[PDB]
Design a protein around this ligand. Structure first.
Ligand SMILES: CN[C@](CCCC[B-](O)(O)O)(CCN1CCCCC1)C(=O)O
Ligand SMILES: CN[C@](CCCC[B-](O)(O)O)(CCN1CCCCC1)C(=O)O
Ligand SMILES: CN[C@](CCCC[B-](O)(O)O)(CCN1CCCCC1)C(=O)O
Ligand SMILES: [Mn+2]
Ligand SMILES: [Mn+2]
Ligand SMILES: [Mn+2]
Ligand SMILES: [Mn+2]
Ligand SMILES: [Mn+2]
Ligand SMILES: [Mn+2]
Lengths: 314, 314, 314
């Protein structure tokens, strides 16, 4: 049976807009922990991480808040590894997506053979040198990939990072805002991806079959799902910092996560980039958090066809 | 050519919210009868059923308004059988979904070999003993299924019911809010279903091919379509009592019904759960009724590709 | 590499509502020309066409403004042929869809072997004799088809027209409001079409594979894409004169145009029926123009998966 470890990561300095720090808080007050208990799940809350303010953190070239982002990920890596050693599925509530550096790193210390599914409008694979914004939430994958070592500069705050995943061990789903440098890396490294074009072409059904066969065909291994809520269309998740139109539907998001749950191999989960302060109305915040909660519950067994306990209901 | 018998069923006591009684009225004032005449159809209106008030109707255990629901279905069964004996396709305008007990029962008196297609967010297959709400609109299928006799208590108002359909003769499309007891019955009885997960997986195209091959592969027979407007997403049909997000699209609803029309075997139709009083705005009511009318017109021949009379237009 | 010739066609008299004349203006102020330059494209603006007022233009039978529509198309045909002789892809910004008579005609003077893809809720294939509205924007295809000569009356303003395309050389995508006369022509002439029913059945992926194999299977040839913004659902393009619900999605629109771009054979493009004055709000106008611009950029190489220059980004 599923056992879960919840880690709050109230961190925003991987991007400019502040309110993503309240992500863990609004997801908890939506009753995420209770709803997980309502279904099959043994839940332990490891709390919100205390991220010290590092007030002296000047840009490294164009890269903003590098020491703050680096330490937050260092701390998160430690907590995630701690939850994995305890035999639980780590559930990280973000927080901006730079935290994936820490989440995937901590996870990989215990399960070096993990495969990553990255649901997002973005590849987040800019390097400190290709980025034009300097926002580190658009860079976490570059820090993680083995093939890109020697292309990543010695950024203050990140000396602890050892890139733990090969380009062959990640699949993107939902891409529709990919920078030129990122596209170059994507094609050069031969990374498997299903942009919105592929989802339109094949249907989400075939996308998931291909995703899972690619990642699990040779050998069964732990899955890490890094879910950026901007992966889904802004009609479902508007309260987020970098919304892009033409996204995955609510249905597609639940299909992705239902299929991931059914593998029995989900080992780590990130629910990222919920920013309640960017909702144009109270309903837009509710709609975003509701969807993120629904996505999460699907990851842990809630099926649209229904669920039942192993007894005779009649 | 198609010949139709319209029966209004202004009934609400299968659920708590009152305004579903006005379903027949708003569908008629939308010009449903006229629009049916505009296309190929010979239409006879059998009127709105007069449902006597039964003021003495205390719950049977948890089950609410059982005598009221039972008599309404008894009356509707009689009217439907009357319209079928006259060689017409029965079109029942609801009204809450408990009325399906009467619609399917009346239909089956004349065509015992009918197969049912049930488009809905819900299976409506709770028994009087598995229900946690007591609302009979969530129970009609349990009263209809032969396999479940002996599991249905002697509910006041329902002594006239003889379950007329086998578990093998129904297909669900659109499921996304299925209670644990219902899921148990679903799996135990081996009922064919396409929840939203299956629609996402396969596409509505394959769903309809499988639905129709399953029901009509061995032997051609009459089709009964029980269409709950909550089958479609609340962005298309918001004015309904139990809306669930992540539903079938407008397009999917028209595809289902276009394909059903093309079989030449539609024999009975229910258009259920339109509640104009639950529209948050006047436009939400219009949008809901418009969609329900569009769905109905598709059932009777209106095709998106166009239609033409058997003459030379040039 | 792609080279483009922009032609503004501020013309409205193919239909009753006036504001479609401002189509070229709002598309330009959206920064269409600049955004085309931002990506691979060499852009030359051939200006907005000066359409003389023809104040004496009484209906021909039921057909409205025939001399105005005819001359506007005659003028546009000349300009388009001029841009094609200069080796550029013609990009016509409309303007109502009657202008397609001129766009396709001018294009075909230089490339007689063109195949047409027509993305629209409508077939626009009524003749002056089958039309019930008299609005010429619902008639341009009938003037273009060789198979229909002798069925088109001598309409004032159109003596210059020579029908340049066979019924075999056009594919419709997006149909859901087809008049009886149009359906008759569709079936009689054996025109290839994918109404919304077919898109639902097969998926846009298979639709494009079939569309392109049909048009380009025997012999590679120039493609003319006539894109009516009402092809997409009114939730994406509301500011248009004849919106029909149940349309192609934003994603489907970009998929169509991405796949068309990838053939390397796009030769002519029409972006038609944007009417900013019919937006119920300022956001509805912005949403419509934004989408039309996005559609256009996709036609000229912008891919959702990303794009990059032929250099080493690392
Ligand atoms: C696509 N790259 C962006 C967005 C990063 C989003 C990170 B996420 O976690 O939400 O996915 C934007 C770069 N563009 C900004 C607009 C102009 C072109 C560059 C970046 O800052 O790197
Ligand atoms: C899913 N079952 C419900 C809804 C019935 C809808 C009937 B219809 O005709 O619209 O399809 C709801 C039961 N749940 C209520 C919420 C808490 C869990 C139980 C019930 O009352 O049985
Ligand atoms: C479908 N035909 C219409 C619409 C033409 C739209 C042209 B376009 O460029 O936007 O595609 C409408 C005819 N109907 C009007 C409503 C009643 C039935 C006839 C016509 O006027 O011919
Ligand atoms: Mn993102
Ligand atoms: Mn991201
Ligand atoms: Mn229902
Ligand atoms: Mn129902
Ligand atoms: Mn049109
Ligand atoms: Mn058109």
């Amino acid at each position: 049976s599923r056992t879960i470890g919840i880690i709050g990561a109230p961190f925003s300095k991987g991007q400019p807009r502040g309110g993503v720090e309240e992500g863990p808080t609004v997801l908890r007050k939506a009753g995420l922990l209770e709803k997980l208990k309502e279904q099959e799940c043994d839940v332990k809350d490891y709390g919100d991480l205390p991220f010290a303010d590092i007030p002296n953190d000047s840009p490294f070239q164009i890269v903003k808040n590098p020491r703050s982002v680096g330490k937050a990920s260092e701390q998160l890596a430690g907590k995630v590894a701690e939850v994995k050693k305890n035999g639980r599925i780590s559930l990280v509530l973000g927080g901006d997506h730079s935290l994936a550096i820490g989440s995937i790193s901590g996870h990989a210390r215990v399960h070096p053979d993990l495969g990553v599914i990255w649901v997002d409008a973005h590849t987040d694979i800019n390097t400190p040198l290709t980025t034009t914004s300097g926002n580190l939430h658009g860079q976490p994958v570059s820090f993680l990939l083995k093939e890109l070592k020697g292309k990543i500069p010695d950024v203050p705050g990140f000396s602890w990072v050892t890139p733990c995943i090969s380009a062959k061990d990640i699949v993107y789903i939902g891409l529709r805002d990919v920078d030129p440098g990122e596209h170059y890396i994507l094609k050069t490294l031969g990374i498997k991806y299903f942009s919105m074009t592929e989802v339109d072409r094949l249907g989400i059904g075939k996308v998931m079959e291909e995703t899972l066969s690619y990642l699990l065909g040779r050998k069964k291994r732990p899955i890490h799902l890094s879910f950026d809520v901007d992966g889904l269309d802004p009609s479902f998740t508007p309260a987020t910092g970098t919304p892009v139109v033409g996204g995955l539907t609510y249905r597609e998001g639940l299909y992705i996560t239902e299929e991931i749950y059914k593998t029995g191999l989900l080992s780590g989960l990130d629910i990222m980039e919920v920013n309640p302060s960017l909702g144009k109305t109270p309903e837009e915040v509710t709609r975003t958090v509701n969807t993120a909660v629904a996505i999460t519950l699907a990851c842990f067994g809630l099926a649209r066809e229904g669920n039942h306990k192993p007894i005779d209901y009649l």
